[PDB]
Structures are given as structure tokens and as C-alpha cells.
Design an enzyme around this catalytic site. Structure first.
Site, short mmCIF file in Angstrom:
data_model
loop_
_atom_site.label_atom_id
_atom_site.label_comp_id
_atom_site.label_asym_id
_atom_site.label_seq_id
_atom_site.Cartn_x
_atom_site.Cartn_y
_atom_site.Cartn_z
N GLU A 49 4.85 -2.41 16.38
CA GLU A 49 4.09 -3.62 15.96
C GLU A 49 5.35 -4.05 15.09
O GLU A 49 5.93 -4.65 14.96
CB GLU A 49 3.31 -3.05 14.22
CG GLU A 49 2.09 -4.32 13.91
CD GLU A 49 1.40 -4.03 12.44
OE1 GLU A 49 2.72 -4.11 11.75
OE2 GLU A 49 1.04 -5.19 11.77
N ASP A 60 2.16 -12.33 4.61
CA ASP A 60 2.86 -12.12 4.01
C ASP A 60 3.33 -12.05 2.78
O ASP A 60 3.28 -13.13 1.86
CB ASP A 60 4.26 -12.33 5.86
CG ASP A 60 3.97 -11.60 6.99
OD1 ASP A 60 3.70 -10.39 6.70
OD2 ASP A 60 3.12 -12.62 7.20
N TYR A 175 -6.53 -0.72 11.58
CA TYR A 175 -5.33 -0.87 10.34
C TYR A 175 -6.64 -0.72 8.96
O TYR A 175 -6.58 -1.30 9.06
CB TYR A 175 -5.08 -2.59 10.96
CG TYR A 175 -3.44 -2.42 9.45
CD1 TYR A 175 -3.58 -2.45 8.88
CD2 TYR A 175 -2.68 -2.92 10.55
CE1 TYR A 175 -2.40 -2.50 7.68
CE2 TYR A 175 -1.23 -2.56 10.47
CZ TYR A 175 -1.05 -2.94 8.79
OH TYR A 175 -0.03 -3.26 8.14
CL LIG Z 1 -1.05 -8.07 7.48
#
Ligand SMILES: [Cl-]
Ligand SMILES: Cc1ncc(COP(=O)(O)O)c(C/N=C(\CNc2ccccc2O)C(=O)O)c1O
Ligand SMILES: Cc1ncc(COP(=O)(O)O)c(C/N=C(\CNc2ccccc2O)C(=O)O)c1O
Ligand SMILES: [Cl-]
Ligand SMILES: [Cl-]
Ligand SMILES: [Cl-]
Ligand SMILES: [Cl-]
Ligand SMILES: [Cl-]
Ligand SMILES: [Cl-]
Ligand SMILES: [Cl-]
Ligand SMILES: [Cl-]
Ligand SMILES: [Cl-]
Ligand SMILES: [Cl-]
Ligand SMILES: [Cl-]
Ligand SMILES: [Cl-]
Ligand SMILES: [Cl-]
Ligand SMILES: [Cl-]
Ligand SMILES: [Cl-]
Ligand SMILES: [Cl-]
Ligand SMILES: [Cl-]
Ligand SMILES: [Cl-]
Ligand SMILES: [Cl-]
Ligand SMILES: [Cl-]
Ligand SMILES: [Cl-]
Ligand SMILES: [Cl-]
Ligand SMILES: [Cl-]
Ligand SMILES: [Cl-]
Ligand SMILES: [Cl-]
Ligand SMILES: [Cl-]
Ligand SMILES: [Cl-]
Ligand SMILES: [Cl-]
Ligand SMILES: [Cl-]
Ligand SMILES: [Cl-]
Ligand SMILES: [Cl-]
Ligand SMILES: [Cs+]
Ligand SMILES: [Cs+]
Ligand SMILES: [Cs+]
Ligand SMILES: [Cs+]
Ligand SMILES: [Cs+]
EC number: 4.2.1.20
Lengths: 253, 395, 395, 253
Positions: A49, A60, A175
Site C-alpha cells: 500500500e 493521517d 480495509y
Molecule cells: Cl487510511
């Protein structure tokens, strides 16, 4: 291409979990980044990734914030990232390559054109961090038209309506971020689930696989190692290799 | 799934990580509920009147329009408790947070007025307030930083990105994603993901409602135009909202022209940027060719933001509202003029709106026009900045 | 010969050189005329409402009285244009000057709020304004000095005497004696020679009038007490006037105790000075044994004056009003408390009144009492002073 | 005592104007002040007007403001001023001595007591700068009970009602600041008028006497000379003497 499906098929036949690391493209420079990535693969990474440096990475924490700084400090641009991706795929034909993008970088020169470029360089999936399923239609459409898997996050605050949507819309893998989630996802024939919830040690990988996930994504621990070893490119690689091997070991059982 | 439309034509939406979507849905539901609740409305009205001081004056400015056929009124949000319009919507958002059972407040600020408004509302209403502020801003806004802290707020410096308002905006969103069960994000403009552009408008709309009633009382007709500066869009949309359906009334938004549009050092994305996705919304952005978010520039910290709320982008697109720019030097002249000739020291943000109205008057001085400028704040915070400029330019 | 009584019992009078007596007689006549003139009253009301923002809020402060039987309201003169009560009476005096055909304004200031109010009123109404300010004050009030100048006022530094407010007061009187055909002296408190104590009261009385109406509306009865700080006496008498004949309502004036009355470093002449003649009036003074006027002291520049208006001395003498003192440290605590618990940053002058009300509450917390504190101004001007203290004391 | 009346009688019989200088007591020190004053008298001063240093001299311009500073800088107090006055009168039995006071210094320890002390040391008049005729009653009463002349200012903005009041209430001389004023004052049997309006040269004295005034008061020009010659006590006296002689010359014609 069927890189994710082929990987999962092989891992399912080897009763084996996936381990997938994240790194920022061009952190801490283009050449070193290319070498970092080759080390991850050589050390047992099942897939990659890859982040593209962005001015405003909303999803983030500080680890990856600083990764972006490092990349920008080296003058890394999206076009340079696509050059790298082409070189990576040219070296490594089967490893699934997913991008973690911010929406503006996908939308910038046209959504279709972005996905077309991903297909041209041999990318397999795109997760757009700031596009929820509610806003995802033009992204997942463009992705599928260009043979790219759109990846969706299933968060720890998910509900049943969201589980059906993610199951229906996502491809490649889901995910993740429990057994309610994992079993409902399977019940709904979702793409195989990868756990990505602060996974930073071999046990985590084991525990993920045991819960019924297809593998684990290490979204941050890798960049930490980059971060700690900046002054020592040689040792960086050794630690990277060490770590990935351990993580990958934990997935065979 | 939402209760209300997240878009204004093409612009707006909810461009946040999936994890934040329940927070936005929760907030939308609480807002829809609150808007139907006479008890909430009474509480909000009580705070606006008896705490903040509403209604605000509408002041006719005779000296600055002498010898022209312009009649100019200023809507005096400079007189609201806190010294700017920001106070209105923080009171409503603070009540929403309470209604949701939240005990903590997150808020971004650059200049500091929203931070101070967030802190004072939190002090009054017993919420624990943290303010994210780009380190660059903390450095330059010691006064506002201290006011916030006096009022018991925690000011958290942000070193990520370019360490400014945008990054501050980013930081607030990051925190909220993980804390939204306990904390409410008190966004300080009419931008970001739905439902914020809608909530902020509705909790600022009394500006325009009062203006309308005041101008009917004094003049017996609606204004020809209402003029407001645009940082992210709250004071302008607060002034515009109640006039949208009055098609004769011009709605003029003023973006900062900085050192001049042609220099690229400005904060005028609506007219000189291009559509992107950032801060949870699809809206005009100042962005690089590659799609990185650019740094904006304005002499006025409050206008120094490289995007704009989606309702403004929409109102422009259909031609209902018109958007212009005013440079640093134009804003400074308007600042000096109002001090000298009306005895009111305006915020440098508000000075941009004033400068455009003065331009409308001066360019066509025999044109009959009834104008209202939203004087969004007082300019005590700006007296040092202005002093340093006048001294450096030699006046 | 006068139209109105220049004295309040023993206190007051017109202790000026003979040359100034026609100026005082002229002003008195113009005032008496104006008070009967509905056109003047309408003009004054217009400015107070549409320019200054009246009526001001009356805010109930629930957090700071929790767990006691005190109900405390603040009269929000901090929200008036200019940031203090001073603005009210300058608007009336500016109209008086115009009525008299004067084109120039003289005004004294120390702290600067009156100077700023004088300058803004002069800017609006087209009078040429000069401000006399002790050099010592000029040095310490750069901000206010610049606001005045932005608004077109000439600030004249005064080096005579102790180069402060008193000497500033002296300077303004000197100028006026020679210029009174062209200039009006816009005295900034309810003191000095008749007719100023009377004029300033009448042009501040809306404070108390509004308070009365507001407390009847909200509580259905008059307050047990109204509490105001005393520099020269204007904000206090403005609050008191409409209550004088309501014998149940306590009238409490708060003088600055400085470092403590026993130190001699204070500004509390009414209770700790003795009667003298200075600044055109017979009033309590801080004076040396020999009869020289002493320097006063307060952390709050606005209260740092060694005398007091004659109406206060009179109201005390007959027991109608009671006067107390509050030290620097008490005022500072009240300042911090209001910021933290109500989200309002009060002037350090006003903080003295607040501190006394908090003392009334804390000393007898089961005593049922409905109190109003006149919050005469906002404390933006004080944030540096407070910062420097908190930092030096180690908080 | 009848010092003013005796002076005016002598000056009227010598067809002569009065010249009266003002100085601040104790400027620039007690000993030098005493010597200054002796120089004024020796040089032809007909009478004296003497100021007592005060914190807040409302009726004084910068010249005398600075005179007060100089005196305070030497620690001069009102009690010290009364000591000086006694020493002055002891040396000079006939010269009229008037004080220029601020009200607070007269009111401080009781108005009656102030005037009683003036009488004890041999002062002839008191002008209280910040007491207009409207407020003068307790001052002029105490003055007269102690054989002190209360002096009133007749300003250039005076009216007829004021002229009658000043004429009625004042004694010793009327402090002027035209022929309307001078003749009305005489018509109203006012104390003889001294012109005090910025008189700083011999012609002024002449012009005053010609207008029908009994003399002139030099309220400031003297302190200017003190001011200019601080560094040179010797020359100070010479210039003082020079000036006074000139002024006094102008009054004989
Ligand atoms: Cl993410
Ligand atoms: C008096 C005044 N007048 C106008 C403005 C312009 O803001 P507008 O009325 O919302 O368009 C400001 C904006 N001030 C900011 C910026 N606030 C801000 C701006 C953009 C995004 C997030 C923000 O917190 C603050 O942080 O206080 C202001 O203070
Ligand atoms: C907010 C506020 N609150 C209270 C006060 C106290 O003054 P008060 O309400 O008149 O008793 C002030 C007084 N401030 C002065 C002093 N003004 C002043 C004081 C005394 C003599 C002459 C003066 O010009 C000024 O110059 O602005 C103030 O600003
Ligand atoms: Cl699927
Ligand atoms: Cl509603
Ligand atoms: Cl409703
Ligand atoms: Cl103009
Ligand atoms: Cl603090
Ligand atoms: Cl904290
Ligand atoms: Cl954060
Ligand atoms: Cl209506
Ligand atoms: Cl009308
Ligand atoms: Cl129009
Ligand atoms: Cl229109
Ligand atoms: Cl562009
Ligand atoms: Cl339209
Ligand atoms: Cl235009
Ligand atoms: Cl027209
Ligand atoms: Cl009236
Ligand atoms: Cl009337
Ligand atoms: Cl408390
Ligand atoms: Cl200026
Ligand atoms: Cl000037
Ligand atoms: Cl002067
Ligand atoms: Cl009534
Ligand atoms: Cl009631
Ligand atoms: Cl009572
Ligand atoms: Cl009482
Ligand atoms: Cl005393
Ligand atoms: Cl009584
Ligand atoms: Cl008490
Ligand atoms: Cl009780
Ligand atoms: Cl005099
Ligand atoms: Cl007589
Ligand atoms: Cs109001
Ligand atoms: Cs006009
Ligand atoms: Cs902007
Ligand atoms: Cs209470
Ligand atoms: Cs005082």
C-alpha cells in the site's frame, strides 16, 4: 488483471494470512524509496500500500504526516510517483499494488484520467482516504472501468447498512478499521478482509488471521522504522527486512 | 443517507473518512431536531439578546458618502460580545453540543476571533474547550491566545503541513474523528462537510433578518445591495440568507485580493481558483497544477484561507450573488477612512467589504444606491498591524 | 448667578479663575436649553441607539453565584461602541458643543477610554478634537493614543506637575479659558466645576434607567443593590441616578484600594481623604498635611485619580450611598473569575465593582440578594497588564 | 495697616504709576529667593506679588509652572513661605506685600486661620487664583476680619454686573486682566486698578498709567529673567535690577 484474487487464492491454498505494509512513495527520497520497496518485497511483503505525498493528509497521524514532509522536502510530485509505480511493476509482475490517495489528487486532472493512468502503470487498487461510501460513486465507477479495485474502509463504528454497502462496492480487499464484522462481511460476500488497526507486531497478524480475516495491513509501523534509521540507510534496510520477515512469519501460522 | 441536501448544485458534500460519517449524521439529526424545538430556539434567543447583545445597530454613515448619491449603512456586528459576528453561531453550536450530551469543544482559528468566541461560549456553558491553531498563528496572535487561555481554553499549536489555518482545520478534524463521542467540533465558518455550511448559515441568518427589518424601518424599502467579506463564508451568508429570495437585492461577496490577483498572492479561490476536494467539501480551491492545496495570502488573517464555502460557489454559479476582490492597499484605505470620518475602527476583514462599497460609490457618484456593508468585526486586533504598515510606508 | 444649584450640600461649586466663569455659565444655559428641546433629545437618542448600540444588555451571571442565594446581573456597558460607558455622555456633550456653535473639542484622559470616546464622537460630528494626556500616560497607553490619532484627534502630552491625569485635567482647563469661544471642554467624569457634575450625570442616567426597566422585566422587582466603581464618578452616578428616590435600593460605590488603604497607595479620597478645593470643585481629596494634592495609585489607570465628584461625597454624607474599597489583588481575582466562568473580559476598573459584589455574596452566602454590577467597560486594554502580573507572580 | 492706600496716596501726589513685580517664593531656593526679592525692592518695586508653590497651579502658564517646580525641587513648603514673609516684612516696613494663592492652600487648615497668619507676618493682600467672586464670600470675610485686602481679577470678558461686584468686594487694588473698564471701575469707586495683562516692557507701564490705571503688575517677565540666569546668580540680580529700574522709570512718566 487479477492480482488480489490470485494472491488470496494462493494464500488460501497455503492456509496463510496476507501481510501488507504501507510506505510513502518517495520517503525519504526517490532512489531510497525504490530500494526500501524492493526490501519490503524481498523480505516477504504479500502486497504493497503506497501513499502519494499530499499537502493536507486528513486521515493521517504524525508518523505519516512527517513521511509526507520528508517526501516534499525531496521535491516528490504525483507524476514522479507514477514514474516510480511503473518501475516497481516492471520489476515485480505479480505483487498487488494499492494506492492510498487523497481525493483532490484523484479529482485534479479528471477522475477517469487518474484511474486510466493507474491502469497504465499496473496499479491494482485505490483507497481514497477522504471519500466515504456515500460519496464514492464516480470513484468506484472509474476504478472498475479501468480494472482497478476500489478499496473501502470498514470502521469500528460501522453498522449493518454500511456493511452491505462496503461488501457490495468494494473489491480486492476490505480495509478493516471483531467477529460480527468479519462474519457479516463474508455473509455479504465482501472482498476478503484485511485488518489494518494499529498492527505493529507478529502476534497481531496471527490474531487477525484467527478472527477470520484474510490477512493484516501494517499501516504505520514500517514508516516508524524508516523514521528511526534516517541517518543509516544500510541499517534501515536491515531493520525493515527483519520486521517484515517476522510479520510475514506470523501469517503462515 | 441524510435528512438534508448536502450539496448546493455541484458544490459541498461530505468528503471525510468513513470514520467521521456517524459524527456528521448525528450532528445533522440534532440540528434538524433543534430547529423544530421552541425550547432550543428560546434558549438561543436568550443568549443572543442578553449575553451577546443582539439586535446589533444599523448605522447610517453620512460623512463618507457626502457629495454622492450613495446611502451607506453598516450592520454593526463589531458591537457583538467578543467583537465579531463569530459569536452568533458559536452560541447555537454550543447549545447543539449540549443537546447531544457532549462535554468538550474543538475549534480551529487563525486570526483568533472564532477561537475567542468558542472559548467564551465554552466558559459560559460549561464545556471544556480546546482550540487548534497553526503554530504560525499562535506566534502572531499572542493577544487572542491569552484571551482564550484567560477564558479557560486550551490552545493547541499545530506544526503539521504549513502550520496554519488549513492545517489547524485538518487537526481539528483529525481530533474529532477519534473523540466525537465526547467532543463537538465547533467549525468557525460556513464551509467544511455537511451539515456545517447549512448549520452555520442558519445560526448566522439573524444578521440579514435584522438588517432587512432595520432598513425597512429607516428607508421603507429593501437595499439595492448588501456587501460582505468572504473568508470561509459565514458573515456573508449570514447577511445574504434572508435576502436570497428578494431578487432585486444584490448580494456581493468580497474576497481578499492580497498583493493583487496577478501576483498569485491573494485569497480569492471563488473567482481565481478552481474546484477541488479538501476540508470535507467540493469547492473552489487555490491549488497547484498538480492538485496540492496552495497557501493563500491576505493582510487580513481572517480572510487568509485558500477555499470558500460551497453555498457561495453555488450562488455565484447561478448568478444570484456576485463576487469581487479588494487588495491589501484598498482594505487599508477603507480602514483609515472609517476611523477618520465615522469614528469606527473596523476589522481589516470587514474593511474589504467597506472598500468595495466605497468603490461602488466613487466609481459612479451620481448613481442612486442604498447599500449595506456587513461590518463583521471591530479592528482593535488590527491596530498594531496597521500601525506597523503606516510607519513603514512613512505616514 | 446660575440657573441650577452648583452644590450638593457642602460639595461642588465653581472654583475656577474668573476668566472661565462665562464659559461655565454659557454651558449651563445651553444644557438647560437642550434638556427642554425635543429636537436635541431626539438627536441624542438617535446617536445612542443607532451609533453606540443602546440599549445595552443586562446579563444574568449564573455560574459565578452558584451555591449561594445571590442573583447577580451585569449591566453591559462593555458592549457600547468604544468599549466603555464613556461614549454615552460624549455624544451628548458633542451635541452641546455644536448647539453652542463650537467647532473644537478639548478632553482629558489618562487610561484613554474617554479620549477615544471624545475622538470618535469628534470624528462623527465634525469637531476638531485635541486630547490632553499626562506624558506618563501617553507613554503607557500607546494603543489608545494611536486609536485617537487614527480617528483624527491631536494628542497633546502634558509634562507639567506630575505629568498625569490631574495635570492633564489642569492643562485642559488652562486651554479652555483662552479658547472657550471656539472650543468646548469635554470633561470625562462627573466632577470638576458646575455644571459638569450635573451634565455628566444626566447624560449617563440612561444606564440606571435601562437597568431599572430590565430588572423589573426579568425579576418583577427592584434590585437590593447596584454597585459601581468610582474613578471620578460618572459610571456610578449614571447607574445610581434613577434609583436615588427608590429608598430600598442600595447604592454602592467602589473606590480603588490600591496596595491597601493602610499603605497610603490607593485612590479612595471619599472615605480616606479630606475635603479640599481642586479642579474647580470642593470635594474629598488625597492631600498632604500641608494641602498639596497627592498622587493617587491604582492598578487600574481609570480609577487612579486623587478626588471624586461632589454628588458622591454628598450622597455619602447623608447616608444615601455607601462607599467601600477593593484592592488591586481583589480586582485581579474578580477579573480572572469573570473571564473563566462567564466568558466576559471586564475592564480592571469594572473589576473593582465586580470584586465587591463577589465579596457581598461570599461573606454571606445564604443571604438572599439581587445585585447589579455596572460593568463599565471591556478589558481588552488590560490584557497586557494582567498578563505581565500573572507572569511575574508565576501563574 | 494701610500700606496700599498709603502707597497710592504717595504715588498720586508724585503723579506716578505703581510698578509691581510677581515672583515665586523660594524660586530657585530660599536664600536666593530672599536676595532676589531684596533686589526687586532696591531696584524700585512699589509693591510685591508673591506666589506660594502649589501642586496644581490652574491659572499659571509654563513660566510660573516651572517656577513652582524649581521651588519644590528645593523642598519649599507653605510654612517656609510664611517664615520668609515674616523676614521680608521685618526688613521692609512699608512695601505692600500681596500673595497669589491657590484656594486649597488657604482652605487647608481653615480659612480664618490662614488669614490670621497672613496678618501676623504682615501681608497686605491675598488674591486667590481659583476663587471667582461668585465663590469668594468666606475668603473676603476672613480677609477683612484680619486686615488683609482681598484682590479680585477683572478679566477682559467682564460685564457690568461683574464690575459692580469687583468694585464692591475688592480692596487694595483691582487686578485688571480699555477705558470702559477703567472709568466704570472708578465710577463704582473700586480699589485703584493695576493692569497685569502681559506687561513686559516700560512702554506697557506708561500705556497703562495713561489709560487711567494706577499702575501695572508684571506677572511673569520677572520669572523669565530668573529662568534665563539660573547658572549665574550674580548676573541674575543685575538683570533683575536693570529690568525693574526701567519699568519703574516708565511710571514717573
Ligand atoms: Cl487510511
Ligand atoms: C471579524 C471577521 N470578519 C470576517 C471573517 C471572515 O470569516 P467568515 O465570515 O467566516 O467568512 C473573520 C474570520 N476570522 C477567523 C477565520 N475563520 C475561518 C475562516 C475560514 C475557515 C475557518 C475559519 O475558522 C478567525 O479565526 O477568527 C473575522 O474574524
Ligand atoms: C471603563 C471605565 N470604567 C470606569 C472608569 C472610572 O471613571 P468614572 O466612571 O468617571 O468614575 C473609567 C475611567 N477612565 C478614564 C478616566 N477618566 C477620568 C477619571 C477622573 C477624572 C477625569 C477623567 O477623565 C479614561 O480616561 O478613560 C473607565 O474607562
Ligand atoms: Cl465484492
Ligand atoms: Cl427555527
Ligand atoms: Cl420551532
Ligand atoms: Cl471621505
Ligand atoms: Cl490564564
Ligand atoms: Cl489546558
Ligand atoms: Cl491532532
Ligand atoms: Cl416578518
Ligand atoms: Cl421611511
Ligand atoms: Cl440591485
Ligand atoms: Cl440583483
Ligand atoms: Cl487556478
Ligand atoms: Cl439569480
Ligand atoms: Cl463594481
Ligand atoms: Cl440612479
Ligand atoms: Cl430631557
Ligand atoms: Cl423635552
Ligand atoms: Cl466561581
Ligand atoms: Cl494616523
Ligand atoms: Cl494634529
Ligand atoms: Cl496648556
Ligand atoms: Cl417609566
Ligand atoms: Cl418576573
Ligand atoms: Cl437594600
Ligand atoms: Cl438602602
Ligand atoms: Cl487625609
Ligand atoms: Cl438616605
Ligand atoms: Cl459589605
Ligand atoms: Cl435572606
Ligand atoms: Cl493670576
Ligand atoms: Cl472698594
Ligand atoms: Cs442592543
Ligand atoms: Cs449621500
Ligand atoms: Cs478566502
Ligand atoms: Cs444563585
Ligand atoms: Cs478615585
Amino acid at each position: 488483471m487479477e492480482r488480489y484474487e490470485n494472491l488470496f487464492a494462493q494464500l488460501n491454498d497455503r492456509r496463510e494470512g496476507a501481510f501488507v505494509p504501507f510506505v510513502t512513495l518517495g520517503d525519504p527520497g526517490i532512489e531510497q524509496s525504490l530500494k526500501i520497496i524492493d526490501t519490503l518485497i524481498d523480505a516477504g511483503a504479500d502486497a504493497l500500500e503506497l501513499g502519494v505525498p499530499f499537502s493536507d493528509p486528513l486521515a493521517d497521524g504524525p508518523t505519516i504526516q512527517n513521511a509526507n514532509l520528508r517526501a516534499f522536502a525531496a521535491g516528490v510530485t504525483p507524476a514522479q510517483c507514477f514514474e516510480m509505480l511503473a518501475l516497481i511493476r516492471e520489476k515485480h509482475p505479480t505483487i498487488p499494488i494499492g494506492l492510498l490517495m487523497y481525493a483532490n489528487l484523484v479529482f485534479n486532472n479528471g477522475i477517469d484520467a487518474f484511474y486510466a493512468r493507474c491502469e497504465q502503470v499496473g496499479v491494482d487498487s485505490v483507497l481514497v482516504a477522504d471519500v466515504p461510501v456515500e460519496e464514492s460513486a464516480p470513484f468506484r465507477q472509474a476504478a472498475l472501468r479501468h480494472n482497478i479495485a476500489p478499496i473501502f474502509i470498514c470502521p469500528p463504528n460501522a453498522d449493518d447498512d454500511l456493511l452491505r454497502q462496503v461488501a457490495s462496492y468494494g473489491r480486492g480487499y476490505t480495509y478493516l478499521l471483531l467477529h460480527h464484522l468479519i462474519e457479516k462481511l463474508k455473509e455479504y460476500h465482501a472482498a476478503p478482509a484485511l485488518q489494518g488497526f494499529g498492527i505493529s507486531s507478529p502476534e497481531q497478524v496471527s490474531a487477525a488471521v484467527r478472527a477470520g480475516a484474510a490477512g493484516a495491513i501494517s499501516g504505520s509501523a514500517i514508516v516508524k522504522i524508516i523514521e528511526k534509521n534516517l541517518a543509516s540507510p544500510k541499517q534501515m534496510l536491515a531493520e525493515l527486512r527483519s520486521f517484515v520477515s517476522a510479520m510475514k512469519a506470523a501469517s503462515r501460522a | 443517507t441524510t435528512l438534508l441536501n448536502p450539496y448546493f448544485g455541484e458544490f459541498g458534500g461530505m468528503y471525510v473518512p468513513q470514520i467521521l460519517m456517524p459524527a456528521l449524521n448525528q450532528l445533522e439529526e440534532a440540528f434538524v431536531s433543534a430547529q423544530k424545538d421552541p425550547e432550543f430556539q428560546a434558549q438561543f434567543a436568550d443568549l443572543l439578546k442578553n449575553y451577546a447583545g443582539r439586535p446589533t445597530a444599523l448605522t447610517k454613515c453620512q460623512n463618507i458618502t457626502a457629495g454622492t448619491r450613495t446611502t451607506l449603512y453598516l450592520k454593526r456586528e463589531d458591537l457583538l460580545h467578543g467583537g465579531a459576528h463569530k459569536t452568533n453561531q458559536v452560541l447555537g453550536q454550543a447549545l447543539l453540543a449540549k443537546r447531544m450530551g457532549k462535554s468538550e469543544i474543538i475549534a480551529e482559528t487563525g486570526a483568533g476571533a472564532h477561537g475567542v468566541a468558542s472559548a467564551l461560549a465554552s466558559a459560559l456553558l460549561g464545556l471544556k474547550c480546546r482550540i487548534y491553531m497553526g503554530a504560525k498563528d499562535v506566534e502572531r496572535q499572542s493577544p487572542n491566545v491569552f484571551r482564550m487561555r484567560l477564558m479557560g481554553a486550551e490552545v493547541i499549536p499545530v506544526h503539521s503541513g504549513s502550520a496554519t489555518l488549513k492545517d489547524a482545520c485538518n487537526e481539528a478534524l483529525r481530533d474529532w474523528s477519534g473523540s466525537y463521542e465526547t467532543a463537538h467540533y465547533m467549525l468557525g465558518t460556513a464551509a467544511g462537510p455537511h451539515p456545517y455550511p447549512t448549520i452555520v448559515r442558519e445560526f448566522q441568518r439573524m444578521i440579514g433578518e435584522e438588517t432587512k427589518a432595520q432598513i425597512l424601518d429607516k428607508e421603507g424599502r429593501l437595499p439595492d445591495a448588501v456587501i460582505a467579506c468572504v473568508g470561509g463564508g459565514s458573515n456573508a451568508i449570514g447577511m445574504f440568507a434572508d435576502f436570497i429570495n428578494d431578487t432585486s437585492v444584490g448580494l456581493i461577496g468580497v474576497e481578499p485580493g492580497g498583493h493583487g490577483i496577478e501576483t498569485g498572492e491573494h485569497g480569492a479561490p471563488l473567482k481565481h481558483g478552481r474546484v477541488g476536494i479538501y476540508f470535507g467539501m467540493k469547492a473552489p480551491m487555490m491549488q497547484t497544477a498538480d492538485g496540492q492545496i496552495e497557501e493563500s495570502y491576505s493582510i487580513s488573517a481572517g480572510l487568509d484561507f485558500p477555499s470558500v464555502g460551497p453555498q457561495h460557489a453555488y450562488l455565484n454559479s447561478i448568478g444570484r450573488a456576485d463576487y469581487v476582490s479588494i487588495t491589501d492597499d484598498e482594505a487599508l484605505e477603507a480602514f483609515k477612512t472609517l476611523c477618520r470620518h465615522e469614528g469606527i475602527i473596523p476589522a481589516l476583514e470587514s474593511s474589504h467589504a467597506l472598500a468595495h462599497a466605497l468603490k461602488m460609490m466613487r466609481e459612479q457618484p451620481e448613481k442612486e444606491q442604498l447599500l449595506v456593508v456587513n461590518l463583521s468585526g471591530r479592528g482593535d486586533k488590527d491596530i498594531f498591524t496597521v500601525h506597523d504598515i503606516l510607519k513603514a510606508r512613512g505616514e
